[PDB]
């Protein structure tokens, strides 16, 4: 009596091809596919392509499933109910500025300027002039200029101004003060909140402007070394790729990355029970256990 | 033209598909669009997601020769080993059909 | 298996292509030489499976500064790239400095 | 770095160092071409056994 | 014209015997955040050529945006009309739907 | 029966695969050579059993 | 393939033709001399394709 | 640094084992210490039982082509002579199954 | 790489003996941590001898 | 967690002017936890997991 | 367990008190690792002073 045809699940040879959407496992694990009915299948062949409705799919029309992505910014949920993977060519909406950082090394041998009415164009009346750029709700740029003026010993006043507001007032009061230690370490006054102007009916971008990790220890002349913010203008999709840890990421035209899901692997408590279903897929059933999903990073996978 | 002038007789339109490898190769060096590829999505040369042209130049055929001359050696052995199953399926049938 | 032979034969062909490319670009101006570095492959067993191209790096040393005479040319002597934009909006970084209007 | 105008940058390709690596890449190719011959001849006999 | 308001003018340019339009056909008003507020549908009649009965159609500027996207562009146009044609090919798809081109 | 030859046929295949891998890895930088070693096997009988 | 050699050989021939032309036109009156500019060629892969 | 001074930032620790030839191989150019290899036995470059480092240098590959191209011949002849037992066994079993 | 660790060609971090305080001198028995090359400024040091 | 007491032993050491000081061998018999990665069957009949 | 070689002509530390603040008043600093019952590690430095 023929008892039963068994399989042999040792690993094959990894052959490189050079195509974009091809992936291959090196240890135990299976991709988890669905189709138009909800019948889950498990597979090992990794020839994936797109379709008319832009979902990742194999060469016979079975959708590649994974963990979905949502949030602001979009994050991958760790263990959610699995969904099909889509790559939308829709544009990215813009994001408004909420925080900005600006390190600065001031000069410890810089004398106090004599023209004590603090002007804007009369270039004696300030020591250092720096600029940052922020983005409004629509995506328009606003230039926030900062002026650093030494007032007395180890004390620097900071004045702020907007340069793209056409109805801009000239500021007459100081935005903040910075007091320095005897050694050259920042102590207090390390942050400020400031709201920029208004153009084209957009929202007024309010943001924090913390001056953290600054120093003042006779470093030649004055300079800024690290300026950044958390905002961006819009864009549209230019490329997609599959990283080495499973997450698919799309690259847009405004130098940003956006995750779109990650490929969930499945490892079984017992092989040799998966009934074959024609094409390059298997089918989990009794005498094989439950699916035992997981991620491709770490664990047993 | 002969009167210090220029006329514009049209602009070449390119097309871009949501999915390649669904384009059916029809006859000559020509593809045709169908299902599992999408709609045409015409566009201009420069702006958008479409590359730029080049005058006075063509494009070759990307076929490696050394990479293709070492797959014939594998395909010939695959054929000659598949042919050794018909040998056994004929020999067992010949020895079955002549016992009685 | 044919695999140990064919992976080596595949990886010794990119090693000739990246030398032929360096030879053919012996007069391009803002060009940097390249090289290929390899890495072996092992499954769970003890015998090797072949070889794998780990990535083609680049050599970012500075070339010689060649005089031309034209007015709109710039050359850099240390780190730093010119920043140019496309017609689309994509930013790009370059080292060649032949400019026009 | 500095900026020198009126001048361009050359290619930094050393022709003598690349006319030597061709001789050692061609021998690697020709030696790996002798494993395919052995794997082909040790399938020829297993085909022509019977 | 002013902030977050645009004016759309329509013209037909195949029959040259039409009215030169200077009257504002419609206006598009955008949100303070950058989506379409209201006024996305227009009705437009065309001219008559070669004695055929003219065409009145709805026109929808739905799902637009105004968010400083570089310059202006169009991304998706469609309508549901066609010229006559004759059969050249037929085939059977993967769900039994016989189609003909 | 066939096992005395099948064992030798299987043991002379890794003895080609390790040479093929040593040939193919002749240009990487942190590679160490590969050698294989054989040893016969016996049961409680007096004839051999292969390799 | 053959391309890395053959495009390089084709493009290092205009670099001799534009020198021969300038050597030949060494006495005409309106002539302005010239050189040629090259460019590398890269597909979506990482290995270059010529010039 | 800019002020004509220098600052250290680390030191590369080496490790030597009580027994080589027992480290498992993990794909790319790395090993993994297990049983029949031992514990780490970490140290520095100059002192102790560790050879010196040099910089601007890469270690080569120690595979001699003259000693591996003349083992292919011996392995191919061993394969071809082990194949010659199966042919006699086939012919004997054919005789035995079609006697009478 | 971009976080300025000494990392080999596949993506694994090269360990070593760390440094402590300023003026930094290498310990001999610490828990080995990966080497970083920070770009931060050197703080000054006041005179004590002449 | 609870503490750990242990006997540390400098057995079979030496001082005989051997250049500078270095520790040649060190060991202990405790281990951090881990999870199962393989099983095998020995010749005696036991099954052992690594 | 830990073996060690100690240099015999090594001088006495000329610093008069012992203190782990500076790297002066000891001859040798070495390490060992042990593990608690919950599994986590404890570094024990050992200081040899002649």
Swiss-Prot record, chain A:
One of its GO terms (biological process) is bacterial-type flagellum-dependent swarming motility. It comes from the Bacteria. Coiled coil: none annotated. Disulfide bonds: none annotated. It is found in: Bacterial flagellum basal body. Transmembrane segments: none annotated. Keywords: Bacterial flagellum. Signal peptide: none annotated. One of its GO terms (cellular component) is bacterial-type flagellum. Belongs to the flagella basal body rod proteins family. This is Flagellar hook protein FlgE. It comes from Salmonella typhimurium (strain LT2 / SGSC1412 / ATCC 700720). The chain holds residues 53 to 353 of 403 of the full protein.
Curated annotation (Swiss-Prot), chains B, H:
Disulfide bonds: none annotated. Transmembrane segments: none annotated. It is found in: Bacterial flagellum basal body. Belongs to the flagella basal body rod proteins family. This is Flagellar hook protein FlgE. The gene is flgE. The chain holds residues 304 to 403 of 403 of the full protein.
From Swiss-Prot, chains F, G:
It is found in: Bacterial flagellum basal body. It comes from the Bacteria. Belongs to the flagella basal body rod proteins family. This is Flagellar hook protein FlgE. It comes from Salmonella typhimurium (strain LT2 / SGSC1412 / ATCC 700720). The lineage of its organism: Bacteria, Pseudomonadati, Pseudomonadota, Gammaproteobacteria, Enterobacterales. The chain holds residues 2 to 52 of 403 of the full protein.
Curated annotation (Swiss-Prot), chain K:
Disulfide bonds: none annotated. It is found in: Bacterial flagellum basal body. It comes from the Bacteria. Coiled coil: none annotated. Belongs to the flagella basal body rod proteins family. This is Flagellar hook protein FlgE. It comes from Salmonella typhimurium (strain LT2 / SGSC1412 / ATCC 700720). The gene is flgE. The chain holds residues 153 to 202 of 403 of the full protein.
């Amino acid at each position: 009596k023929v008892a039963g045809i068994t399989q042999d699940f040792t690993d094959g040879t990894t052959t490189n091809t050079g195509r974009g959407l091809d992936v291959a496992i090196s240890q135990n694990g299976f991709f988890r596919l669905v189709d138009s009915n909800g019948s889950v299948f498990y597979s090992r062949n990794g020839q994936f392509k797109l379709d008319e409705n832009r979902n990742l799919v194999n060469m016979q029309g079975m959708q590649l499933t994974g963990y979905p992505a949502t949030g602001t910014p979009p994050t991958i949920q760790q263990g959610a109910n699995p969904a099909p993977i889509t790559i939308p060519n829709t544009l990215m909406a813009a994001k408004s500025t909420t925080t900005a950082s600006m390190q600065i090394n001031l000069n410890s041998t810089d004398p106090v300027p004599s023209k004590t009415p603090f002007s804007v164009s009369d270039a004696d009346s300030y020591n250092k002039k720096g600029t940052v750029t922020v983005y409004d709700s629509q995506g328009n740029a606003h230039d926030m200029n900062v002026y650093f003026v030494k007032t007395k010993d180890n004390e620097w006043a900071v004045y702020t101004h907007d340069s793209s507001d056409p109805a801009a007032t000239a500021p007459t009061t100081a935005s903040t003060t910075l007091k320095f230690n005897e050694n050259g370490i920042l102590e207090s006054g390390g942050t400020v909140n400031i709201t920029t102007g208004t153009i084209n009916g957009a929202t007024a971008a309010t943001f924090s402007l913390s001056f953290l990790n600054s120093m003042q220890q006779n470093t030649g002349a004055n300079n800024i070394v690290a300026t950044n913010q958390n905002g961006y203008k819009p864009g549209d999709l230019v490329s997609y790729q599959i990283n080495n840890d499973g997450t698919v990421v799309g690259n847009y035209s405004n130098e940003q990355e956006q995750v779109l899901g990650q490929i969930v692997l499945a490892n079984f408590a017992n092989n040799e029970g998966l009934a074959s279903q024609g094409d390059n897929v298997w089918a989990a059933t009794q005498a094989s256990g439950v699916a035992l999903l997981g991620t491709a990073g770490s664990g047993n996978f | 033209y002969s009167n210090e002038q220029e006329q514009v007789l049209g602009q070449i339109v390119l097309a871009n598909f949501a999915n390649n490898e669904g384009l059916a190769s029809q006859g000559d060096n020509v593809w045709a669009a169908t299902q599992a590829s999408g709609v045409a999505l015409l566009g201009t040369a420069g702006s958008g997601n479409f590359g730029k042209l080049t005058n006075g130049a063509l494009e070759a055929s990307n076929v490696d020769l050394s990479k293709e001359l070492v797959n014939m050696i594998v395909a010939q052995r695959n054929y000659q080993s598949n042919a050794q199953t018909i040998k056994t399926q004929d020999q067992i049938l010949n020895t079955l059909v002549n016992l009685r | 298996s044919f695999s140990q032979a064919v992976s080596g034969l595949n990886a010794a062909a990119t090693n000739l292509d990246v030398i032929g490319n360096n030879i053919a670009n012996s007069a391009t101006y803002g060009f940097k030489s390249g090289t290929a570095s390899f890495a072996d492959m092992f499954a769970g067993s003890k015998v090797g499976l072949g070889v794998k191209v780990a990535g083609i790096t680049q050599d970012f040393t500075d070339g010689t500064t060649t005089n031309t005479g034209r007015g709109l040319d710039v050359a850099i002597s240390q780190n730093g790239f010119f920043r140019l934009v496309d017609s689309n909006g994509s930013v790009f970084y370059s080292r060649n400095g032949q400019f026009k209007l």
